[PDB]
Amino acid sequence: EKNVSIVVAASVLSSGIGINGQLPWSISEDLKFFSKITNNKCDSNKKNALIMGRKTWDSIGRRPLKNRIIVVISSSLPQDEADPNVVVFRNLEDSIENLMNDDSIENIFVCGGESIYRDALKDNFVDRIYLTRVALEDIEFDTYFPEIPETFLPVYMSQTFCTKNISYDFMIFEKQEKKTLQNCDPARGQLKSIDDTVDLLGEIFGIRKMGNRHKFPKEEIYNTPSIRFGREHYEFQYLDLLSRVLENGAYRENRTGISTYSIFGQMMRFDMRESFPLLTTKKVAIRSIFEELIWFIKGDTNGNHLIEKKVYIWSGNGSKEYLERIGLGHREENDLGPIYGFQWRHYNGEYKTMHDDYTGVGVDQLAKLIETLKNNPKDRRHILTAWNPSALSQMALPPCHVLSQYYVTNDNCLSCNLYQRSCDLGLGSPFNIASYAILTMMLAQVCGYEPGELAIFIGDAHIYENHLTQLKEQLSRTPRPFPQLKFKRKVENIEDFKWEDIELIGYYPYPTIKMDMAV
Amino acid sequence: EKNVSIVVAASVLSSGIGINGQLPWSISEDLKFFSKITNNKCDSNKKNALIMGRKTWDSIGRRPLKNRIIVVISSSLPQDEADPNVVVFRNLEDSIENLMNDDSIENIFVCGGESIYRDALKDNFVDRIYLTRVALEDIEFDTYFPEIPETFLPVYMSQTFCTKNISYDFMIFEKQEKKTLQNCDPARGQLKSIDDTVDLLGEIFGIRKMGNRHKFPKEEIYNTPSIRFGREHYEFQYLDLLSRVLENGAYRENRTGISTYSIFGQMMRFDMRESFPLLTTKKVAIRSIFEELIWFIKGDTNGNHLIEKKVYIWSGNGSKEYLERIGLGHREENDLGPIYGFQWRHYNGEYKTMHDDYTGVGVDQLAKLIETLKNNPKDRRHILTAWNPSALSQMALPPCHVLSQYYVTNDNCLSCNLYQRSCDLGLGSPFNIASYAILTMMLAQVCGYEPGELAIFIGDAHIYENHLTQLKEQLSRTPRPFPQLKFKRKVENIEDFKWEDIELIGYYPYPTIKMDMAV
């Protein structure tokens, strides 16, 4: 019994794998991967065999692949004796006897040809699938990878990588299904003694055992459950936080009329070197995000300007009825007060109205941040805060993304940490992630660095009860590789960034999911 | 081949297990545990057997334990036929034939008697050890649990639990050692496909694959390495952060003359319901911690007051030469400036000197925090901050524990989140953990709640290079159960707390390790 694995790279949406006898893209790391995986073996005295259709054989230029043995499936091609590393077979089944002998052949790989893939799957010959998902979907394709039969489940999904601005994943599908329930927590199943003890200890003490307060998500609320030990894609950092509160979230009321399910003190990590963290399990409005960010950067507090750029999130907390209700009825229709941005560019500035000219008043943190970031990178005080005890009363809403710290790595990457006191996982969080990611990129370009990592620390992480069905739907979608975000020009001053300067490359999200805010 | 496990509870330091024919303590959850574990079986048609010395049999009052079969080892006791659930044997070896038959006996448990334990181990009869470590060590003992032979390695260590203010753990030792290197990362070893793929992907991309930037600690710098899937004790949250930077920490210079190894954006969790997070792998000065805390609480900035209470951490940054050096030479010998405490009780207050009377000036956050905490618990704005862009220049040192948020659980527990921009893992961190734990407890008592959980989010988590040998030593010590911290009286106002009011119960740390600070 030998192993038969499929190795293929197909576009994320339509599974395109070829065009006019060539790959529809050029990513060397993937050729490099293909080589590593199909060469990977245990017995130095054996070799792996790569099965492939004749046309694919033509693609390779009919030249052997070092250390391996190529098996071509063709009805015409002569069954030569010449090359000992290349052998021909008349049908796919007969070829797969590599098993039934050639104990010299350690592993088998179905290397391609829509025809050979489709047949390999149909005749149930393959055990595993190594799928490289490539993020370019509006180009011509004439060859495809068949749909993965249900008997196959994903067990791994790598983070997103970039090459020539093209995003791509690496995931492994295994043909499993001799099971039952099976625990999603990867910590269990290692050794019964630990599991039994923990369970019993769990029975004796209850809510007293901290672990019981942090129960692991039940399968039905865990995204792509089959990937148990390979949830490497960072979008799982958010999807899993979602599952975690759905599982442990305490039901509780709040200032808005809609109750939430919340847990306190959570974390999310996101790579920004090889991709941009814009959720794919739901379409996210990047323009709106951007427009709110430069708004902050400018130190603007006039909610009209946002409405004008057709961004309406601050309308609710900007309305005359809301301001009246929170004791700011003297305030104009959309004068949000000394909120973010005002604190960013004018910390402690004495606020009057959204019209006054604050040039010169207060402390300009953003400015200092940028200045300190490039003149003293290793410094441990690169901080930006919006929490001003003295201004709170005048704000239409207290700062949620309360404080952020920046770090310049030794390899000149710029990372960012953000502490968020309150976080609406269903509506806001997706936007916060993207927002601070962009801000970091901007700060990086301006200070001559490149994006590093983004870590987010949440205080009250919650889900509004009116988002339950939406988030359940979102959780049913398997993540796609993150897109790439690039600036079209090098701005000189951070506030010069314009929408046109931004490029969102390779974003292929699932349809948007409507979720209403609580005023 | 049946399984033979030892079940015992012994004091943390001298392994005392008995006194005048009784346990030297009374913890029901542990009796409850003993019952659960020794009853735990797969086959409803079989039973477990509990072997025990005659004296222990006397302890039980010579009455059978429901659902189980007691096997007494005695040279005198009559081999009756009466009770079918109790059977006598002349020597320990003969009794262990429970294996060689009684297929009705599913599992075996060596239940006690220093004599029987010692013999069970000596004759290599036991496969596993369930050890309940109890935290009371200055009481009389006449019976002990022998030292665990080296052939045994710990594979699990629970969090600490409390009963009548007595701390205790639960750990499992397994008699293993048919191995080799073995990876410490619990994520690996699940399925080769994932491991191989990740490794290869790791070869192709490099520092580009985020995972390679977060390498898992190498065994030689991982504390108690054998516990791979059971590092439940929360002291591992700190010990492991230590290992993590020792593994990935980037070497970098800083304001002080001593370079560090640092990583950015880390997290630590600590339970405060069943115990107090005062590290055990090194003796920590709780009094000093306390004295600095009320100092903050009082809004005091006079570093002399600390020196007077024989606390010297702020001396360095208080010296005349340091103040001169940072442009504060006009300042008096120990006038630290608008640091923590001043910002806590007088946010934005216009600072003069450590002598002026600031009563009434600035915003009193602590006061508001306490007020808001009890009048509006579910509120999502329970925040305390020390980061004041306008006062930084006057501070002898910018705030490290920058901002903290508080949360009141539905079950009336008070949890705390802290964001620390810079953290000296070797010298300061241990103290910060304890410090904020205490503060939370104080805030809780005053607001009528009880401690919940403590989560700490670090920005620049680092290790000064002159602490490497010390921390390596610390890492060689296996954690002991956390102690308990209790207040002797209910204070009416948070600033009324006095050292005498505090009780540190059951703290049994390893000798203190001297580690010098960088000015």
Ligand SMILES: NC(=O)C1=CN([C@@H]2O[C@H](COP(=O)(O)OP(=O)(O)OC[C@H]3O[C@@H](n4cnc5c(N)ncnc54)[C@H](OP(=O)(O)O)[C@@H]3O)[C@@H](O)[C@H]2O)C=CC1
């Ligand atoms: N992205 C990826 O991972 C990969 C992409 N590709 C791409 O796919 C395209 C090549 O594949 P595709 O066009 O399907 O062609 P394939 O490589 O499958 O080759 C088809 C040929 O294989 C032989 N063959 C197929 N089925 C049988 C059968 N049942 N019995 C006998 N012989 C059979 C036939 O050759 P004969 O006529 O001589 O009898 C047939 O013409 C290229 O564009 C290539 O770049 C290829 C591999 C991987």
Ligand SMILES: NC(=O)C1=CN([C@@H]2O[C@H](COP(=O)(O)OP(=O)(O)OC[C@H]3O[C@@H](n4cnc5c(N)ncnc54)[C@H](OP(=O)(O)O)[C@@H]3O)[C@@H](O)[C@H]2O)C=CC1
């Ligand atoms: N903390 C924990 O987990 C536990 C604590 N304990 C405590 O330990 C104490 C009891 O243990 P300890 O004093 O050692 O007494 P033990 O229970 O070992 O009993 C000793 C007796 O067992 C018989 N025995 C022992 N060895 C042999 C042998 N080699 N051959 C034949 N008979 C043997 C003898 O009885 P005989 O004279 O009649 O021949 C001997 O007097 C109590 O204080 C009890 O509370 C007990 C179990 C667990």
Ligand SMILES: Cc1nc2ccc3ccc(CNc4ccc5c(c4)CN([C@@H](CCC(=O)O)C(=O)O)C5=O)cc3c2c(=O)[nH]1
């Ligand atoms: C995931 C994946 N699967 C594949 C399966 C079959 C393929 C067949 C042809 C090609 C493109 N054509 C060639 C043609 C020749 C070679 C390689 C690819 C790869 N390759 C090297 C690897 C590339 C390198 O040297 O860096 C090898 O050792 O196999 C070749 O010599 C790609 C795939 C992929 C592919 O590109 N990616």
Ligand SMILES: Cc1nc2ccc3ccc(CNc4ccc5c(c4)CN([C@@H](CCC(=O)O)C(=O)O)C5=O)cc3c2c(=O)[nH]1
């Ligand atoms: C209960 C609640 N209140 C808020 C009040 C003000 C906010 C300001 C900013 C953000 C985060 N930033 C953005 C920035 C842009 C959009 C959204 C959020 C949400 N959003 C909606 C559209 C606008 C809307 O929902 O009204 C969407 O789903 O596409 C945006 O376009 C969230 C809130 C919340 C929030 O997330 N939740």
Ligand SMILES: Cc1nc2ccc3ccc(CNc4ccc5c(c4)CN([C@@H](CCC(=O)O)C(=O)O)C5=O)cc3c2c(=O)[nH]1
């Ligand atoms: C970890 C551990 N191991 C032990 C091993 C042997 C012991 C022998 C005697 C006693 C103390 N004496 C008695 C005497 C009688 C009973 C129990 C304990 C426990 N027990 C219940 C459990 C207690 C309960 O009912 O809650 C049982 O089902 O076994 C008894 O009937 C404790 C241990 C421990 C022990 O207390 N803890």
Ligand SMILES: Cc1nc2ccc3ccc(CNc4ccc5c(c4)CN([C@@H](CCC(=O)O)C(=O)O)C5=O)cc3c2c(=O)[nH]1
């Ligand atoms: C480089 C550096 N500088 C500092 C400057 C001021 C600090 C103030 C408070 C704390 C954290 N709080 C405490 C509170 C009490 C003690 C210690 C730290 C350390 N510590 C020493 C004794 C005093 C000393 O080291 O001088 C010990 O190891 O026991 C204490 O007694 C750390 C620093 C650091 C710090 O941790 N590292």
Ligand SMILES: O=c1ccn([C@H]2C[C@H](O)[C@@H](COP(=O)(O)O)O2)c(=O)[nH]1
């Ligand atoms: O960037 C933002 C803006 C605010 N909110 C949400 C969080 C809360 O659901 C609500 C504020 O609630 P309070 O903190 O005011 O109670 O707005 C976000 O999630 N992110």
Ligand SMILES: O=c1ccn([C@H]2C[C@H](O)[C@@H](COP(=O)(O)O)O2)c(=O)[nH]1
């Ligand atoms: O509560 C505290 C007081 C400060 N420090 C340490 C952290 C740094 O090692 C040093 C301050 O360094 P800078 O942030 O000033 O660079 O003091 C702590 O760890 N905890």
